[PDB]
Amino acid sequence: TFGYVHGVSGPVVTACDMAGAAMYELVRVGHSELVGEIIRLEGDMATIQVYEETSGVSVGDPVLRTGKPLSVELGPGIMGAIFDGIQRPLSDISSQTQSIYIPRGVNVSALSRDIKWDFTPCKNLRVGSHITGGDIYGIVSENSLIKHKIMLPPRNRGTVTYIAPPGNYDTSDVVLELEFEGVKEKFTMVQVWPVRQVRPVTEKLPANHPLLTGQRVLDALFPCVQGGTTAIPGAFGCGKTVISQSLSKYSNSDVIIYVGCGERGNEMSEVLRDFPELTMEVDGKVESIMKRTALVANTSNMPVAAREASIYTGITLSEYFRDMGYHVSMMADSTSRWAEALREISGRLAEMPADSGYPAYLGARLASFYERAGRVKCLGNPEREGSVSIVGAVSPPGGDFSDPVTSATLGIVQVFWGLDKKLAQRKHFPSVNWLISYSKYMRALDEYYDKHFTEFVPLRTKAKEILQEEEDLAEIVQLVGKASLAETDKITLEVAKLIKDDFLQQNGYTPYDRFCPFYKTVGMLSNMIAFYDMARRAVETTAQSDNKITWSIIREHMGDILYKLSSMKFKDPLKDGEAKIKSDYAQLLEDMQNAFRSLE
Amino acid sequence: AAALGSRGSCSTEVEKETQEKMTILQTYFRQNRDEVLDNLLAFVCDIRPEIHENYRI
Amino acid sequence: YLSQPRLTYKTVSGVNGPLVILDHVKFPRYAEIVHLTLPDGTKRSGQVLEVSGSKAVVQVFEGTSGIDAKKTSCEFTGDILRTPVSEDMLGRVFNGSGKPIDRGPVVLAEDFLDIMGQPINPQCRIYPEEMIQTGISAIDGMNSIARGQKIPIFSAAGLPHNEIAAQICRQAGLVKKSENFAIVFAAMGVNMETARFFKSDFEENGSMDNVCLFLNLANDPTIERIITPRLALTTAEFLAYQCEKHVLVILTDMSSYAEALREVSAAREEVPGRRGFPGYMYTDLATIYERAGRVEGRNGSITQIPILTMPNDDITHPIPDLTGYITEGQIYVDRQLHNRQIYPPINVLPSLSRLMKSAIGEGMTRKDHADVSNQLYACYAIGKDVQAMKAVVGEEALTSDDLLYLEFLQKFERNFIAQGPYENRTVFETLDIGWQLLRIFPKEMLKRIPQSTLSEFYPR
Amino acid sequence: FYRLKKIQEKKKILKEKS
Structure with missing residues (x-):
């Protein structure tokens, strides 16, 4: 039951006299009882990685075998709790220590027994x-x-x-x-589950229901679902925090699990400070979001082995709340800082890297974590149905699309929201590329749109065609210079500029463009595409007749219809309403129809 | 000329308050050295043999 | 109190580079401190990097020259490196290992503090929102710095990063609406004239009463640079969180520290990282950078300004790359702006400050700060993208407004950025110059500024 | 390539001489 320390080099300890120890078992190292994990066996020697600092551990210290792997406690007392990568309560530790430090070998239970x-x-x-x-x-x-x-x-x-x-x-x-x-x-009311072991279900079902982010560019062009896997870049100012907070304040989720893997210590203080202040509206009442949220907090100076157990703690909490019948949405920030810890731990063990120093089992570990998302029929007698939606932030190492982490991730995820640096430099937010981003759920979402918004798919198709034609014409207008252009090219350019500036571009720090409902999105896109169709038809039919119509004698006639379109994004879905906004949009449609009937 | 004048008087005033601080130090030290000498000499003259806690008999 | 006698081994069994290997050690403790006595009588100090059985692998801070394997005596302390700390350390000059180098006595200790630190509960920290007015427009106007941040200076060889560092140290204060900073300064591998520059600049501006220096020059041992930024950060933590003052920590050549790290990792035959640096350099720089901020209940803070020099002006080298993943932004000193006689040569396009959004605005600096900064950045970007093809294809193929962006380029690099090595601008002067520059464009071309702000600030 | 071959050579020297 007791081995002894034999060597110490960094966070890796070697302990003799460990006969029947199993791989990935948990042990208690030293007189402080630091938790550690067996990662290699050889004869009766064991190699342990320690989740604390090993400074001051002599040769001969005790090593106690616990007999169980790394687990989490699952019971009442998780909503509103702040943990670290090992599920240690950061608020109970401070309340019981009366200090600003985290001791070494601190042993407090994750859920209060009081x-x-x-x-x-x-x-x-x-x-x-x-x-x-x-x-x-x-x-x-x-x-x-x-x-x-x-x-x-x-x-x-x-x-x-x-x-x-x-x-x-x-x-x-x-x-x-x-x-x-x-x-x-x-x-009792608490159970214990190993974090590296997936939780059983009865059946995995296909994902068919959206996950509204609030952003128009993502809800329309690159949708996510309930049970999807998404990858965003970790980019400051681009609109990532908007998404992180929109998942929580106004979505269709029941539980939110936010995991920070390698986190700047002054950017985790922000999250920990202004999450207990966010509120949301439920049944008229205003209630705190920390009633349905759990944070796992890990900063860049904590041990490297606790950095890679954060993802597993978070996803196991997610699965535990999914098995109740809820819809959980996990956010795993800086998957890249997780791969960094993988690489470091692999190097400390003297293993052969594969590409750019990363372990060869990098994709095999990213898949094992992304493939725990999904919509399921929960295991047990009452018929439930749950889901877990994972969003991972993969930061760039300079912006390379062939980083081992980014290339290993794009083989697993179904949605990819891309980062445009040129758009983030011109202060266009959110800086989604919309020409390299993709979503592979636009065919499973078809019978939802064909039942709830039956006219949306053609609008999406035509919007994407316009946005590609504009990019085709741009690098032509750059060289020659827009002198000799067909009028249809002029209309394409001047409708694509509208789509870019008034539909795709959004401001999350304003009280009307913080969460845009889907009826607003569909209405704006419908009016814009209707104008495009009308202008193109007008210029196309009277092509060789008298009084050739051009884009210039359209901007003359309807100059204020071109202003109610460029100001559709200022309606408010909480000062106005659904029927009010719908009536406004219908009236604007009739207005532009009358103008195009009179001019032509 | 004003600089060549102040250069010495400022130095003498600083050397005055220096001596003040040093007398404060010495009057602090005279009134406290014997208790700390007793504590030190009792810590030194109190021996407690001991074996490493990692030693296996 | 460790009262048992210490053990002294004459059992050296190998010297190799910076490391000494010993056998027959009794219960070797990890990270322990060892005192070595050479045959002639000189004394050095080392720290145990790895124990295994009876063996111990010490790294000697002052080198392994003159050490033999039969008459050198290694005395084991029984404890990890705890440095003596006091408040008299302000006004004193030390070397890279904490010994007095100014003809003064050794530090009479108020306390003994572990130099690895003590982890601070993430729930007991405070988010920094007090802007530091450095008096430099390129920083104040567009890359504002909160009091408690960690923001490095990415520089190169031959560029004036010491002038910028000293000007920040000299002019830093709070934004005036109605005391000041203590300074801790560690230098890793600098030349003699850089240290002379910094000492003269500190004592010519009456500061020296409130400055602690740790100096490791390029003629000093290389393995000391590993503990130098940790004695400078253990004093700064005593002053800020026990004596409750606001500290400013400067760490000069965080690149020499990483070169010493690589030099120790290469002598241990470890699986190398990128460019040969250790594979744990991220977890190593993060235990230095993350000792900064404010804690609850205590009225002290620590601001950190490391100073790198990127090899070959390359920002994807391991050192700048890994430093960017840890600190909250960076200030980028450019060489192209240097070669055209601009000071300070700060290129604002790859510079960033991640704590700016919450330190500026109405009630803190002025309601038009963020919009002016955003529009200036966007205009500079568009002007660079114009100037590229203007130099390439056609000085006359330029449009009528593709000449306003070039005039903005010139006046922005000559009037906003270029400041003067002793000029202390307020924040409101910076904002006024920003508006004078934005008035080049008709108000229809400023799409990144709301109408309510344009109506109030543009027509003057 | 050269660094990794060095690491492997040192491995296969240690394991055989020990």
Whole structure:
């Protein structure tokens, strides 16, 4: 049960006398009992990586074998909690230490064993029933919004012997008892799951329902879904924080798990300060977002081995809340700073790199994490249906599209929102490329649009065609200079400029363009494309007749119709409403129809 | 001329308050050296043999 | 109190580069400190990098020249490197290992502090929002700096990064609406005239009463540069979080530190990183850069301004690359602007400050700060993209407004950027010059400025 | 290439002489 330290070099310890230790087991190193993980066996020597600082660890110190892998505790007390990569409560540590530091070997439990939770069992369960893994056997009222379903661990089954009456219990009180084969087993409100081990489901279903970000360029041209995998770049000022906060304030998610992997210490203080201040509107009332949010916090100076366990902690919390029947949306910021830790740990073990120093198993570890997202039919007796949507921020090492992390990621994800540096230099936000970005969900979303917004797909198609034709013409107008241009090219240019400046371009720091609902998006695009069609038809039919129509005698006639289009983005979906905005757009459509009928 | 005048008087005033600080130091030291000498000589003359805690008998 | 006697081994079993290997050590502790006594009698100090069984691998701070394998005595301390710390350290000059080098006594300690630090709970920090008015338009106007940030100066060889550093140190204060900074200054591998420059600049502006210097010159041992930025950051942490003052830490040539890191990693036969630097250089620079900010309940702060020199003016080298992943922005000193007699030669297109958005605006500096900065940046970018093809294809094929961007280029690089090595501009003077430059364009070409701001500030 | 071949050579020297 006790080995001894034999060598120490960096975060890697070598311990002798470790006979039956298993790989990836957890151990306690030294007199401070620092947690560590077995990453190599040889004879009866074991190689451990330590999740703390190893300064001052002598040769001969004890090493205690725990017998279990790296796990998380899952129970009531996760909504509103701030952890690190190992699920250590950063607020309980400060409250109990009364200090501004995190001690070494600090051993405090992730969920407080002191709070009394209001637990009511299920009505039809009773002594003698048959229960299996996944079944919901109680409900704890965690707060005003989130109801915490108490489930059975997925590897248990039996007949009920005792189940607790409604009341107030803490996470140490026994609530259920099962008998399988004459053996007995008691269950409390908390379970324990290994973070590197995926959680079972009944079935994985296809993703068919959108995930509204609020941005027009992403909701229209490059949609995400509930259960999708997305990759954005980590770029300051481009509009990434807008997305991170929009996922939380105004979306269709129930739970939000935000993971920071390698985080500038002054950019994590911002997140930790102004997340407890954000609010959202539910049933008229205004309620804090920290009632349905959990943060995993990891900065760039914490141990390297705790940097790579952050992603797993976050995705396991996500799966735990998915198995209740909720829709979770995880944000994993700086997947690149996670790959950096992978590379460093690989180097410390003297392994052969593959490309640019990275381990050869880089794609195999990114896939194992991205492929845990999806829409599922939850395991257990009540028919549920959950989903986890992962968004990963892959920062560039200068802006290369063939970084090993970026090229390994593009083989796995279904949506890619690209970064345009030329657009971020001209202060066009959000700086989405819209010519290299892609989404592979635009065919699974078809029967949703064909049922709710039945006229949107042609608008999207034509908008994309216009935006590509403009790019074709741009590097022609650059050299020659727009003298000899067909009138249809003039209309293409001057409608593409409208689409770029008034539809794709958005300002998240204003009280009307913070979250743009989808009826607003569809209405703006519909009016713009209707104008394009009308102008093109007018100029095309009277081509060889008398009084040749041109783009210049269109900007004369309808100069204020070209202003209600360039100002559709100022309507407000909370000062105005849905029917008011729809009426305005319909009136503008009739106006431009009358103008094009009169001029022609 | 004004600079050549002030150059010396400023130096003498600084050398005055220096001596003031040094007398304060010495009057602090005279009234406290014996207690700290007792504490030091009791720490030095108190021996406690010990083996490393990592030693396996 | 460690009261047991120390152990002294005459059992050296190898000398190689900066490292000495010992056998027959009794329970070797990791990161321990060792005192070496050479045959003639001189003394050096080292730190244990790796223990394994009975072996220990010490790195000697002052080199391994003169050391043999039969008569050198290594005495083991039993403790990690704890430096003595006090408030008298202000006004004193030390060498790269903390010894007095100004004819003064050794530090009488108020405390002994571990030089690796102590991790600060991320929940006990405070977000920095107090702008520092450095008096430099290129920084104040477009790359504002909050009090508590970490923002380096990306420079090159032969460029005036010391002049910019000293001007910031001399002029830094808070934005005047109605004391001041202590300074800690570590120098890693500088020449003698750079140290002379900095000492003279500090003591000619009456500051020396409030400055602590740690100096490692290019004639000094190379392995000291590893502990130099950590004794300078352990004093700054005592002053700020125990004596409650506002500290400004300058770290000159964070490139020499990384070269010493590579030199120690290459002698240990480790799997190299990119360009030969150690594979753990990210986790190593992050334990230096992340010792900066404000904490809850204590009225002290630490601002950090490292100073790099990019090899071959390359910003994708490992050192600038990894430094950018850790610090909150960068100030970019350009060579093309230097060769045209511009000071300070700051290129604002790759410069960035990530804490600016929350330190400027109404009630902090002025309501038009962010829009003026954004429009100036966009105009500079468009003007560069014009000037490229203007020089390439056609001085007369330029449009009527493709000549306004070139006039903006000239007047912006000569009137906004170019400042003067002793000129202290307010923030509002910087903003007024920005408006005088934006008035070149008709108000229809300023798309990055709202109408409410254009109506109030453009017509003057 | 040369650095990685050096690392491998040192590996296969150590393991054989030890």
